[PDB]
Amino acid sequence: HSSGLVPRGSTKVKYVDKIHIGNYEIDAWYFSPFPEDYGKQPKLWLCEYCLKYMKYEKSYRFHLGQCQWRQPPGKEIYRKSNISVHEVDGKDHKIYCQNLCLLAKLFLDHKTLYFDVEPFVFYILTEVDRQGAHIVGYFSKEKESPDGNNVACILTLPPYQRRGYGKFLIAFSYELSKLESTVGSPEKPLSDLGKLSYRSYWSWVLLENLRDFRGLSIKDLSQMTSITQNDIISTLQSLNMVKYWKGQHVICVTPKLVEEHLKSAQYKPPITVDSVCLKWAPPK
Ligand SMILES: CCC(=O)SCCNC(=O)CCNC(=O)[C@H](O)C(C)(C)COP(=O)(O)OP(=O)(O)OC[C@H]1O[C@@H](n2cnc3c(N)ncnc32)[C@H](O)[C@@H]1OP(=O)(O)O
Ligand SMILES: [Cl-]
Ligand SMILES: [Zn+2]
Asked: How many CA atoms are closer than 13 Å to the CA of 244, on its beta-carbon side?
């Protein structure tokens, strides 16, 4: 894709820059390869339930009155109060997942090809009211990850950002890893916002464990949390809670120092994953 001013005499081919979804309008952050004909109109209109993308307010309004979807496809594997997660296999809901990937790419620097959804499972987060289940965000996961990634992409839609939904999704990804009896880590590279979110999540989990146990190796923490030993080490380093002794990382902290960290404004997830509300078994 091109940016900047086009040369003298040329026509700028417009990309999608604004979407209307439910009762939100959202500006694009990046180019997404919707077909060129969809980019030329002032807005792209998305059905908030089936994610079909449309070119006109009038086709949108017709769709709104006809489409019977009021939630994501697939299985509702998590429900606590009005928060739900649906598991959507890319092989079985190809069109929905393609629509989701084109949406997501508007807010991601890079992504795998939007049509290549079969290798992935998608976990869709919704807030539920009387009208339906309204998409907040999602993460995707490779069914088989050569690199041991437990998340491929993660997104909270911009109007829902900074409310804890991203850390909910991160927590959720590690609950899956724990049930699979494996460690995992997000696919690299992480965006700057990605880095802040993961570091916040990892810090909170590790601090919480170091005070609930009170004191427990890095291996122990990894097995308990499914966080990789490398991500534990980088997080403990940022907490000033690790020493290096003859080439080996050694946790070094007291209960008092853990509490100082937990009592500070820098480290309290507004919504957490309740295992009792999760219904999921590993495939595998
Ligand atoms: C796995 C590979 C990838 O997917 S890399 C790409 C990751 N995704 C993206 O960059 C897409 C666009 N961004 C997003 O969707 C969101 O920013 C993500 C990364 C999902 C975070 O979601 P969100 O629901 O806002 O997270 P959260 O409320 O749970 O807060 C997480 C911590 O991050 C911080 N944070 C967040 N946004 C900002 C910001 N604008 N400026 C400064 N800090 C920010 C929050 O304060 C929070 O940290 P803390 O717990 O308050 O210390
Ligand atoms: Cl916006
Ligand atoms: Zn629809």
From this structure: 4
